[model samples]
Target: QTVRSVAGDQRVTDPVIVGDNSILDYYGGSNYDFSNNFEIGRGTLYIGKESYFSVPNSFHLLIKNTNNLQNNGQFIIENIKRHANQCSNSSIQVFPINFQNDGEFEIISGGVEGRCCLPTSVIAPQNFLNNGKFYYKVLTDTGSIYSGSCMQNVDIGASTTTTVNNNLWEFTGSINAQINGAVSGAAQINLDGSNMFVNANTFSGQVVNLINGGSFLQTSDPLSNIVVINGLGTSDTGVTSIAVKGKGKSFTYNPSSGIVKLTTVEGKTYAYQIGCGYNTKKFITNNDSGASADNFFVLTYSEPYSP
Candidate 1:
């Protein structure tokens, strides 16, 4: 059903809940704002694969709960704007504790100046199944802030178009994709590439690729060992090989393996060495103090609204 207005905040508290293949639309008429912020005060808002939610035009849609959005179908964030003076900033925030997407979750139009906003905290789309399509747009201007992040790793497969305006998006987590998966996003993919594995293999060279600034070469299996390579042979190789590959003129990659790890806060040289065994290699390099593990965050600014 269509929701044009609410007497007060629309919330699912106590025994009430939002689940199953339920569809909702909050696109109101001109000057008619959906000021009734949506929230799940007590239960789960499970949006199954058959469900859909949309907020188009110069509409003000604020689903004010970050811990229960389970999207599985299509959710158009900011469709297109109508009149500037008629609507407020458009944003579909989860901004999440349990936002798991298995369908289409789109945010387009760059969340443009008229389509200002596109924020989220964290919710692992990594638990996604059947190849989810997480779409997005651009963020160029300073007024239209777009701060969104994913946790517990994220999923980007053949079906998902993982592309975002580098100047507008900022992703802070690991990724899940095929070695050749077309994954791209945020401005810079600030991920610890050292902790990812892919293709039933943990190849060393599999961890370096050019996506915007850089994404991961390895895909799938987050909590697994990395930098291990299994040749095309059916376990025919004498042993597996894991090595350290570095960037920049200071540190680089070679056919020979290395025994040093270069953990840089600002960036520096990388040392190489030939270690024992075929697949067991390491890197010896500098370790500078920087942000802690919990510092994986995305900050934003607020532009006070009028009407």
Candidate 2:
């Protein structure tokens, strides 16, 4: 017979009746009697058969008597059953936990299948309003992960802000670089910090060449070592000179003197020259002007060896 016909027949052929104070009269027995034993009914018995049972519905059975013929009872047929599946070896990686009010949001992944094997459920544990749309990404472990038109918008004003300190640095691009320093130049090359340097006119492979043309000593001071290069050109047109100023002394290249010497006063202004050739010489200036003797200068003498 059909499963329903069998169940309907069980209600008659297996009619249970409470006989003693131990059995109930509802479905034919009391819950107390049911807690003790539940196999007292007689009907076609089946174990794990899809055809023998129906889901999405609650079913109840009443067990009556131990030795007597009646007294068990119970009410059946009510409510629905719900169950959730556990994802093995899988977890959701949340990125940019904090977002601006009403900002568009997205996610990415690494091991998850694109669309054919998507997650069975995507839940947000926190209480937040959802506009009905949900999205999934499978690429990066964390951070800004997805890139596409199918994205979700987040309303930060209505959501708790994330305390992520490193989220601001997350990025997904082809190239990345970092630099730090202060600079000054008319045609001047200035690098005020140790972490970086300035180069002008010359190329080292694909980068500019760093030229310290002023007093090598002045450039040594954290504040005064502003390396300056001037009048530098092709070797066929001019001479390039660099000078050093340090220890209250200035050294400049003098073609006539052909030597680097100290000319700086502790508080006086002095210009020293170096790498001298003819009138072309590298020079360093002093604080004689009381401004600050902590500066170096480079003078490129225009001549045949101009480079």
Candidate 3:
């Protein structure tokens, strides 16, 4: 809702706090008995009910002296206007305004000297993020005219689109892709020159390829010991003779057996050494702090496919 003022015979849309003379008189209760009933300078009065003098579409806020008291002291009055959920029955107010006899406006609570105010929008939209609340204290030169603070609620109509890539290659147990060939005996199968590709789709990314072309035991259980051959065995070498091979800077292989490990070249290094013979070869990493765990994956096989 917009606030306007009337001057002479014209209505000005520009919001301005009119001088005390032009400001409407909020009648102190008819029986001004309570001395402390009315404090001075700029405040909000919630009447809960409508008054006879209320203009159409406008609200009537009264501050009459409910307690018959002496001295109807004068004070400044101001209103804080904002477009509420219109029906929310809400109004912003500053409190502990002072009541003085010297005709000086002093704050009693809220700011440095107890002065509080609902500040006008002094900040631009671009200065703050869209659809966010900005709060700051306003310090006056006198130090006494300080306003506790003001919260500016801003809403910049939505702009731009959002894109999300959620493709995760989920593995439940074991993958059946053929390695180079079966090992002659027991040996560790390490993921050597392996690569997994995920493609972006409308809703998420999709895993396109998962490949490991080294040699491992053809009949052995993938969970336990499985041998991987680095060089194609043209000779009658045993399990200990065949080596594991891999190509990459961030790669490490057992110099004796050629079994590669998930090792990093620099930075704080960690490992998910999959085929280590330590009984527990499961490896997991969580780079993102908030996630409870890294995406869980396992490789399992069903009846073989021709592809």
- Cα lDDT tens digits for candidate 2, 210-245: 222211223322333323222322243122343333
> Over the stretch 1-307, how does candidate 3's per-residue lDDT look in tens digits?
2222221211112222223223323322211112123332232221211221231212222222222111122232222222211222222221112211223221111112222232221111111111111122122323232222332221111122122112111111112212211111111222222221111111112112222222221111122322222222112211111111211124343434434443222221222122322111222211222221122122211211113
How would you encode candidate 1's per-residue C-alpha lDDT over 44-84 as one tens digit per residue?
23221111232223333333333345544555443333233
Instruction: Candidate 3: list runs displaced more than 4 Å.
Output: 1-73, 80-101, 104-307
Q: How far does residue 49 in candidate 3 sit from its true spot (Å)? A: 13
TM-score of each: 0.34, 0.18, 0.13
Per lDDT, the best of the predicted structures is 1
Candidate 2, residue 232: CA error in Å? 6.1
| Number of the top TM-score candidate | 1
Off by over 4 Å in 2: 1-217, 221-258, 267-276, 280-294, 297-307
Off by over 4 Å in 1: 1-23, 29-61, 64-67, 79-91, 95-97, 109-131, 139-249, 255-307
* TM-score of model 1 (CA atoms): 0.34
